[PDB]
């Protein structure tokens, strides 16, 4: 189906003990395939999927100036919000930056995301027609002002639905044979027990992307009154999941746990 | 690739 | 170089002098920027543009729809903006990376 | 205050050395260097960003070098100068990168005599 690109940056102010922490990551779909860390020896933007270490020296720096650019700015922004929002030099401040695009099955635009936050909050934010923006706080409002009038808005939302959406293609195609392919959930469940009352854990291992959708059901109905626990990485590149619900004892088949996860020809349904 | 050629808040 | 702009113009004070440069080949990520170096200086920023006109104090800055070409608008010289008038294209990749100026126009104010 | 160069004029002789100094705005990550010959347009000769190299392309290597060690100020020197070295040598900075305006610095002229 439709596919993405993003990157992410966290600019963390040391105050008294030197420049800010930076780090950036860069995803397709659910992959990391770049890195930087200002506090890594080599200073370099890092690949971390095998596609991407076929690109020539020339990407490589080109990727290392623009992060390093990147994090220059965050740097400077970092001093000015302070200013903004009338904070002290004793305290730590944190900028996060996520961008990228998305494209459909043809390979063709869909919509570009760039949103910003200070200390984990919403700052601004650029809106679906990638002209306008989205401020959540007075001090945002000075830096709206500014990029409402700047010309370099301009080629960001080139970047956007251009650029962007061409590198994205050019990845997909270099990493055709794990970008593209889409791993099934293989799913048990487990049976846990006072008396008359159990545990039964639905469990989904082994899939990607990471989407997935768990429901526990009580004879045919939806039971969400259950526990969920948030996707989390297997570290091979494939996720895991569980739902667990309380069952009294002897009402086991009452209970469904259905699964559903694009890789699957139907929806599952389980039952103990 | 990254976006470039941005400007300061 | 990307950039094809006039070796020379000459006007008398007072008028509006426009200077067209032609940059067909410009790539998405690449902006138009304009320096003036006066004699016995360095040069010295004066605008820059990516699509929509942008005006400032000093000169103003036209790009047409399809970005091949761009005109820096004087609005009325003095015989002090005697300089060399650079068009440049470039950006943030590696085919735009490098800064050019090119030998620019020589603009000439007449009393 | 804008850009720092050291020093304004300089006349030698073919085949000896001469260096330039010069000093960026405070906290610009960005510094250039420039040779402009008599009647053309500044040439880039050397881009730091941060403390490393960036641009090396337009070099000329076996006489000319540069080095900018805690990403502040930056020399560049020339060894051994040859009589198509004359030229004015200007420092540049910029707050981020390239797309960023340049300030330019008053520049160093160099003749170099026979």
């Known amino acids: 189906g439709s596919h993405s690109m993003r990157y992410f940056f966290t600019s963390v102010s040391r105050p008294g003990r030197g420049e800010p922490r930076f780090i950036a990551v860069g995803y397709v779909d659910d992959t990391q395939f770049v890195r930087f860390d200002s506090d890594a020896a080599s200073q370099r933007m890092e690949p971390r999927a095998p596609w991407i270490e076929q690109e020539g020296p020339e990407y490589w720096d080109q990727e290392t100036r623009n992060v390093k650019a990147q994090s220059q700015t965050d740097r400077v922004d970092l001093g000015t919000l302070r200013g903004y929002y009338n904070q002290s030099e004793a305290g730590s401040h944190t900028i996060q930056i996520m961008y990228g695009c998305d494209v459909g099955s043809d390979g063709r635009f869909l919509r570009g995301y760039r949103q910003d936050a200070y200390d984990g909050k919403d700052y601004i934010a650029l809106n679906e027609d990638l002209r306008s923006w989205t401020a959540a706080d007075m001090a945002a409002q000075i830096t709206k002002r500014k990029w409402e009038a700047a010309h370099e808005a301009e080629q960001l939302r080139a970047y956007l639905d251009g650029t962007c959406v061409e590198w994205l293609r050019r990845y997909l195609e270099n990493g055709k044979e794990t970008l593209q392919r889409t791993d099934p959930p293989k799913t048990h469940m487990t049976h846990h027990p006072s008396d008359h009352e159990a545990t039964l854990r639905c469990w989904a291992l082994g899939f990607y992307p990471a989407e997935i959708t768990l429901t526990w059901q009580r004879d045919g109905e939806d039971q969400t009154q259950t526990e969920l626990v948030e996707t989390r990485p297997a570290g091979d590149g494939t996720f895991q999941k569980w739902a667990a619900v309380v069952v009294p004892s002897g009402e086991e088949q009452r209970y469904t746990c259905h699964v559903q996860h694009e890789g699957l020809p139907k929806p599952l349904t389980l039952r103990w | 690739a990254l976006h470039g050629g941005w400007t300061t808040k | 170089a990307k950039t094809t702009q006039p070796i020379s113009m000459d006007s008398y004070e007072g008028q509006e002098v426009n200077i067209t440069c032609s940059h067909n080949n410009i790539a998405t990520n690449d902006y138009i920027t304009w320096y003036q170096q006066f004699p016995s200086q360095g040069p010295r920023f004066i605008i820059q543009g990516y699509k929509t006109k942008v005006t400032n104090e000093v000169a103003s800055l036209f790009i047409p729809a399809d970005r091949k070409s761009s005109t820096l608008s004087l609005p009325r010289v003095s015989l002090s903006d005697t300089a060399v008038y650079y068009c440049?294209?470039?950006?943030?990749?590696?085919?735009?990376?490098?800064?050019?100026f090119g030998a620019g126009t020589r603009l000439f104010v007449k009393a | 205050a804008g850009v720092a160069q050291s020093p304004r004029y300089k006349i030698i002789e073919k085949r000896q050395s001469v260096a330039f100094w010069c000093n960026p705005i405070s906290g610009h990550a960005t510094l250039y260097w420039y040779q402009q010959i008599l009647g053309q347009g500044p040439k880039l000769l050397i881009q730091?960003?941060?403390?490393?190299?960036?641009?090396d392309s337009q070099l000329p290597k076996d006489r000319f070098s540069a080095e900018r060690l805690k990403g502040v100020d930056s020399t560049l020197k020339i060894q051994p100068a040859k009589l198509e070295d004359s030229a004015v040598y200007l420092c540049?900075?910029?707050?981020?990168?390239?797309?960023?305006?340049?300030?330019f610095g008053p520049g160093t002229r160099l003749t170099v005599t026979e």
């Open positions: 440049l294209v470039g950006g943030a990749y590696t085919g735009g990376f490098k800064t050019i």
């Open positions: 540049a900075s910029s707050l981020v990168a390239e797309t960023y305006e340049q300030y």
């Open positions: 730091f960003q941060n403390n490393g190299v960036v641009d």
